[PDB]
Amino acid sequence: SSDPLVVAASIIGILHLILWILDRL
Amino acid sequence: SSDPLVVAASIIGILHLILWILDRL
Amino acid sequence: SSDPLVVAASIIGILHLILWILDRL
Amino acid sequence: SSDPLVVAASIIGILHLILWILDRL
Ligand SMILES: [Ca+2]
Ligand SMILES: [Ca+2]
Ligand SMILES: [Ca+2]
Ligand SMILES: [Ca+2]
Ligand SMILES: [Ca+2]
Ligand SMILES: [Cl-]
């Protein structure tokens, strides 16, 4: 388990990557 | 809970994203 | 130890960096 | 505390940011 802040940051990071890929495609 | 280093990195990462968005807007 | 989500995010982040470097080289 | 992999990723992430800033300056 991780600090809730770190979990939040990790989710944002993944969603950032997904949105970027979808934008490029 | 997380290593303090990881908490620090996550905060920096979020603030990086926010500043980028504000810059673009 | 970390949340599995955070471990996943960290792996993706590293692989993102590696792919970027290989692309540039 | 965090998974060693996550600590590694966080260090790389910070160093990435620092190098980028120094490059721009
Ligand atoms: Ca932990
Ligand atoms: Ca806390
Ligand atoms: Ca430590
Ligand atoms: Ca969980
Ligand atoms: Ca482990
Ligand atoms: Cl963690």
DSSP chain B: ---HHHHHHHHHHHHHHHHHHHHH-
Q: Are D20 and C18 in contact (CB under 8 A)?
A: no
Calpha distance C12→D8 (Å, rounded): 13
Calpha distance C11→D7 (Å, rounded): 11
Q: Which residues of C1-25 are buried (b: 16+ CB within 10 A; e: fewer)?
A: ebbeebbebbeebeeeeeeeeeeee
Q: Are C10 and D9 in contact (CB under 8 A)?
A: yes
Q: Are B3 and D2 in contact (CB under 8 A)?
A: yes
Other Cβ atoms less than 10 A from the Cβ of B25: the count is: 5
The first and second tokens of residue D25, run together, are: 């300056």
Other Cβ atoms less than 10 A from the Cβ of A14: the count is: 15
| Torsion angle of the four alpha carbons B1, B3, B9, B15, in this order, in degrees rounded to the nearest 10 | 30
Phi, psi (degrees; rounded to nearest 5) at A4: -55, -30
Chain B CB contacts of D6 under 8 Å are 2-3, 6
The data reach a resolution, in angstroms, of 1.4
- State the method: X-ray
Which residues have CB less than 5 Å away from ligand 5 (the ion)?
Answer: D 3
The first and second tokens of residue A6, run together, are: 């770190």
| Torsion angle of the four alpha carbons D5, C16, D10, C10, in this order, in degrees rounded to the nearest 10 | -40
Calpha distance B18→B13 (Å, rounded): 9
In chain B, which residue's Cα lies nearest the Cα of D7? B6
Neighbours, chain B (3 or more CB pairs < 8 A): A, C, D
